[PDB]
Amino acid sequence: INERNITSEMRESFLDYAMSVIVARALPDVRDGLKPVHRRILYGLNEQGMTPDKSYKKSARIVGDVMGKYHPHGDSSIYEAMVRMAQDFSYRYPLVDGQGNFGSMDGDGAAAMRYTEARMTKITLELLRDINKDTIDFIDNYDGNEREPSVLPARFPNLLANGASGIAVGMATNIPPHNLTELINGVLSLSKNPDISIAELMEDIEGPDFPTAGLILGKSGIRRAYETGRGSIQMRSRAVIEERGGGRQRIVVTEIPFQVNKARMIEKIAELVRDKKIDGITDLRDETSLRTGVRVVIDVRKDANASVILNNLYKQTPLQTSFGVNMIALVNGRPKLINLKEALVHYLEHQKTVVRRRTQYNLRKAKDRAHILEGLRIALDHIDEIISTIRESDTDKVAMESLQQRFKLSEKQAQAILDMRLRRLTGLERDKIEAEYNELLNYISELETILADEEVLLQLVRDELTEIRDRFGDDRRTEIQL
Amino acid sequence: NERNITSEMRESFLDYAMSVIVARALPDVRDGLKPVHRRILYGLNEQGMTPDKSYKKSARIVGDVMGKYHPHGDSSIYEAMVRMAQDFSYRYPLVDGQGNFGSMDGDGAAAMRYTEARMTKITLELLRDINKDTIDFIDNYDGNEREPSVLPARFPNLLANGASGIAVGMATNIPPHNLTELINGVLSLSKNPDISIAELMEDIEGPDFPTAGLILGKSGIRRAYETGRGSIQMRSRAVIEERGGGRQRIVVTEIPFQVNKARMIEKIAELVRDKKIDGITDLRDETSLRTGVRVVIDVRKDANASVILNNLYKQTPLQTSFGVNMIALVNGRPKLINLKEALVHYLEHQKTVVRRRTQYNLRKAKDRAHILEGLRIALDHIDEIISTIRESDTDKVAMESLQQRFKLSEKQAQAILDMRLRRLTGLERDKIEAEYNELLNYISELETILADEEVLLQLVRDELTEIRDRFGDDRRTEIQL
Amino acid sequence: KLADCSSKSPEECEIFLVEGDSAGGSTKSGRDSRTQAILPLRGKILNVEKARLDRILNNNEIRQMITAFGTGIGGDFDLAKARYHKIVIMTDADVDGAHIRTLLLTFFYRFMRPLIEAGYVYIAQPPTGYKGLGEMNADQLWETTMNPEHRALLQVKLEDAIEADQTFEMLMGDVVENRRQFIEDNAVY
Amino acid sequence: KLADCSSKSPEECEIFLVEGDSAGGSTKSGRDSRTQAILPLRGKILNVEKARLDRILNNNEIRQMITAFGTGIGGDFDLAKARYHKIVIMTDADVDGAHIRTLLLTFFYRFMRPLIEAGYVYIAQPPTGYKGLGEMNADQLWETTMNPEHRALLQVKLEDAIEADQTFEMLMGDVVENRRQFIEDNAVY
DNA sequence: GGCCGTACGCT
DNA sequence: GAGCGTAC
DNA sequence: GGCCGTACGCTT
DNA sequence: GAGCGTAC
Ligand SMILES: C[C@@H]1CN2c3c(cc4c(N5C(=O)OC[C@@H]5C)noc4c3F)CC3(C(=O)NC(=O)NC3=O)[C@H]2[C@H](C)O1
Ligand SMILES: C[C@@H]1CN2c3c(cc4c(N5C(=O)OC[C@@H]5C)noc4c3F)CC3(C(=O)NC(=O)NC3=O)[C@H]2[C@H](C)O1
Ligand SMILES: [Mn+2]
Ligand SMILES: [Mn+2]
Ligand SMILES: [Mn+2]
Ligand code: NA
């Protein structure tokens, strides 16, 4: 049976758990900004043909697919992550399009997965774009039965776009979401200047942009975040003071801070009132509706200073909150604390690689296709001999051999001739082959241009980024006040 | 608008009652299945979960059956499938499960996340020839799938595995039987339309519970097979044996069908505590995955163990009745049937299935024969074929030229245009000629079957007999007196 | 768990008896919180016509409604203690939703009969199809079933109490035979 | 609760600590009931090296173990009362099952240290599959991990307390920094 | 269908 | 009369 | 991962 | 604080 040491058991077994949580559960890769469960869900939606045009699919079956295929964990770990990706108060750029009940800011969960359906969002397709053009490196899944991607092409800078929170072992992460327009502009600036300072980059990227909007007090917390990877940022709700009639006033809250549960936050304010720990509040009403949007109302007692009641609610409730920036991501499969430029750098590099690989892959396929078309041309030009040769032959092997000797055709070219359908012999068809060959030759030339010059490839990256910004970039939601 | 409560009550209740009856609680008399079962099996089929292929996560199976056919709670789907995998539940289990699928002690199965299944070899027999126009398909709930109205069911599954279900205004309770005896009874029936229940009972002795046991008397079984309603006394297999030192014990090794062993054991222990049964010193379950069911009742020295046994019969589920109420769906109507009606309806189903299959294979042979006739002509006159194509500027033109010049159907002509060049080599030409000749013998064989009502029937009896020889097993339940 | 509305004015308020917790959750977001209160029902509820009064009274589901309605029951019913002028039954457009209906209407006709005669009881009509209430969005549940401006509630009436007694007794009674006969007399396969 | 060994005799009786309820249930149906008891653990248990003693003594999992071992804890620990001579750690062959393994050993080391010396504490060798303990058969679990015949056990051995003290505090302690550094220094990617 | 334990880091 | 098995 | 509600009928 | 979000 044999023995085992306890100090050695603790170190080995603990180091296995830790690295695993670090590199394969809790932290996002710098390139696509995804944790494993996220990457697998989106890839799963991709391998099931769950694109925006297609109909919704039961969440039960999505999760079940991702579970048995790529993600050998409990199902609620999958489903809940997929539900996060589907909420517009969670994701600055939602990655899942859900149908049914998928929760609210009041912290009410989503219905169980048998009550819901899902599919990709249109912005998600950008994460998956060109995944099938040898752009990223695939690997074997757990049961060695499937293949799954190591990273997505991620045609937009998704780590900063949606941000990350994740508790590892020995470290955690916290990256706030950003405005996609400002983020891409940043990349475009960096692309035409490898030596840009954070100070300059900040002229594109003003700072976080939360889905739940609200205010951020001061640019100083943001600057410390962007230069070092760590800094505290001050999130304040959007509240105003207005009259309610009879010379009395109320506070009206319309945007609450990020990741703050609305329900809980209101119950806190209520507590401070029973406990008599704040003065001047007569009523607390949640008037939020699907048509009004968020609206918490706090009725102030007559001849109490509302502005003073407000500044105390900031100090005393989650009406004002901190976002503790701690930008840790996987960089070359290792956790690194990165600053803004480091993040943007690892991303643009990725795009160059993705686009280079795609252009390379396209060239292999065009060059391979042109080769067949040359053989088909030859065959159609010498068709009567071609046919004779085949009928004369007793086997493929023999027919292959003759065709290759008579016309000097490659093995692949001959194979393509034998596979040809009779209908390709009509007069119209021959001319089509000519066109396709001509178009291909143009294409091959364009592709060689891109690979020949690093500058041209990079401009193409710039141009494809500029299209995403034009199609998907939106206005900043969160106001940054000084 | 405004609505009358007596009208609303009558229509709401009738909507529900009818639904539970024809689409939930009662089995169809042909394949012996309720909707949820039919769907789990048809699901396993569509997802390619065949006995050779490896086991699939239960969650994914349940999810597909729920998404495509059965729009109900996940739990109602999984627990039905779990039942179909238990050898103490199904006389001939339909699902082959890997993982924890429960036991006699009423311990449930592990959640579906932790179990894998595929179909059993016998389930292949339920779905045999499903895709040969043997049974009518129907639109599902979301109009996005087709589902079988009934399964081909190439063995008589309603009586084999039995059925129990609570409907509204009725319920059903049909016991399992021995497959060898049922098939012998269907063959008997197939050679004598006017056979009595009494003569059929020379083949089908009585129920055959997966849990074995003893049935006391034949008269409850006779009343059930004759009216469709009846009571059957099932008794445990207990013996009395010396345990050493003049002392004795009762060893129970088979329990009644549908009796929770655990609950039965606690029931005895509770009688012993409350001093309401005399003479028992110990109660141990020595049942292992290796020894079989073994419940030992130790008996205090010099007590009468035969009296204790009798009293354990009187007070515990060590003796239990099974109450027969053979109500199945017959032309999608609920109907009380006897042994013969059940086997009559089944044989008919098997005839229509063998007919429709033969009828479908014939059409597909004629179709393919016609194509090969087309290809043969082309091979014959290949030079001219090539010409007529080459001299056409569009495939549409070639299609019409080909049909005119060689008197081909539109289908024959399209087939020829599709034909790749490699099909002109020596061997590929021979394969065509060889296919055609084998195909013509086949058509003559099929038309033989469809030419005589008796050849069709003998083929039915032959395919039943084959199933009986591969799948039939020994009786488990003893029928005493 | 009941999620109450803002106004305590019975005259202007309405209560939705919803089938299932997932529909409970969906309903609470989509509603107008100032005038619409929601009390989930977890599945099939006690059939009072078959049950014993001690049981009928100590039942969570049956009780929770007494509290919410707050009017007492049986002999002790006060037509005027009612906390909602609209009692709406909201069930799936399927057979199980229709069974839960027959169960609720059994409950009312026996324990809060004055309430129906008052015309305080209404049957919603969610979109017809293969989608249950739990499976829908909160915005689609509002705009189609709950919104006063585009909803088609059916008020419940009783012209006859004698025929209504024999009806609740034949359909929901414990004599199965009367129930079995009604099917065979009325069933269209 | 724990399913106990029919045998009364501590000398011959073994307890399996099984990760998860599905694995527990299957284990019960598979084990030789004469000498093998089964105490399931619902997921991760408490990290005592970070918890104060009041929380520790209130933990269900921790309390079920103390009970079952019946040997008291800390100062009040007396080997003589031990109800099993073999205590087995049976977890999945995954990183999580290794986490739970390090948790249980933390508890043993800090509370039942005496027991480790006595070497009653063992670690099962389940099939190093892709599968976990909850996805196997009882007969698969029986003859691979439990059958006293064809099974292999790692008996846990302590051989330097000063080394063990520093290690349990660095790995399972509340200071994250030192833990971050041991990861930084020994992790090979 | 919901209700509930734990680890892990950070503020 | 009690717990069988599909439903919410 | 388990715990628990309810309807529904039944052996002449 | 206790709760952010992947795990059992
Ligand atoms: C496997 C479970 C069984 N169910 C139980 C229900 C209720 C209870 C239940 N209850 C209880 O004991 O007190 C309150 C409630 C009545 N304990 O265990 C239960 C279910 F398993 C009703 C049920 C539910 O949980 N939620 C629904 O909205 N709809 C349903 O039909 C239902 C659910 C859908 O499925
Ligand atoms: C979504 C749930 C969360 N879990 C809870 C656990 C435990 C509890 C739990 N309790 C517990 O552990 O002791 C006291 C209290 C009853 N309450 O709620 C829980 C889960 F949701 C541990 C869990 C389980 O339920 N059983 C397992 O065998 N393994 C697991 O990982 C786990 C399960 C697998 O998944
Ligand atoms: Mn000819
Ligand atoms: Mn429904
Ligand atoms: Mn595991
Ligand atoms: Na604050």
Numbering used by the authors:
A (entry chain AAA): 9 to 490
B (entry chain CCC): 10 to 490
C (entry chain DDD), D (entry chain BBB): 417 to 545, 580 to 639
Publication excerpt:
Topoisomerases are essential enzymes needed to relieve topological problems when the DNA double helix is unwound for both DNA replication and transcription.
Crystals of zoliflodacin in a complex with a 20-mer DNA homoduplex (20-447T) and S. aureus DNA gyrase were grown by a microbatch crystallization method, and a 2.8 Å dataset was collected on beamline I24 at Diamond Light Source. The structure shows two zoliflodacins binding in the cleaved DNA, physically blocking religation. The DNA has been cleaved by and is covalently attached to tyrosine 123A from the GyrA subunit (and to the symmetry related tyrosine 123A’, from the second GyrA subunit in the complex). Catalytic metal ions (normally Mg2+ in bacteria) are required for DNA cleavage, and in our structure we can see two Mn2+ ions occupying the ‘B-site’ in the GyrB and GyrB’ subunits. In particular, the terminal oxygen of the pyrimidinetrione makes a hydrogen bond with the main-chain NH of aspartic acid B437.
